[PDB]
Design a protein around this nucleic acid. Structure first.
Length: 65
RNA sequence: GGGGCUCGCUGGGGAUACUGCGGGCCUUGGGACCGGGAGAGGCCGGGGGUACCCCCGGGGUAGGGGUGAAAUCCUAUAAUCCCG
């Protein structure tokens, strides 16, 4: 780590929004580094719940840690 | 005895509105010109950006695709995704 002056980091979060699935994907402000990728069909077992809001909160909570 | 008759013909005289023809004359129609003017009219040359796809490098893992459910099919020499 080369000295940080601000002591705050920022991560732009791309949100790709389908009626077949939801994808949440937060990267660094450049976009050149992928911390974490989590979708709505690892959370669940079935295709119907692949989208919805409830996958699209839980997917966006695992990343967030 | 009187009339009409397909009734498609002819000769002579007469009228001159209309029509024909001939001549003359005029701008209401038409055409024509000049100047201002809008438009996804046509053609030609020039040039920019969107998004989709594709290909290459990096980053990043367990999926994705698809449906009412599914399967065939995409992806593990790495897909989707994100960055260049």
């Amino acid at each position: 780590q080369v000295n940080i002056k601000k002591k705050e980091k920022w991560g732009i979060a791309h949100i790709y929004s389908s009626f077949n699935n939801t994808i949440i994907h937060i990267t660094d402000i450049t976009g050149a580094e992928t911390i974490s990728r989590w979708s709505g069909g690892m959370v669940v077992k079935a295709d119907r719940d692949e989208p919805s809001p409830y996958a699209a909160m839980l997917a966006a909570r695992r990343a967030a840690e």
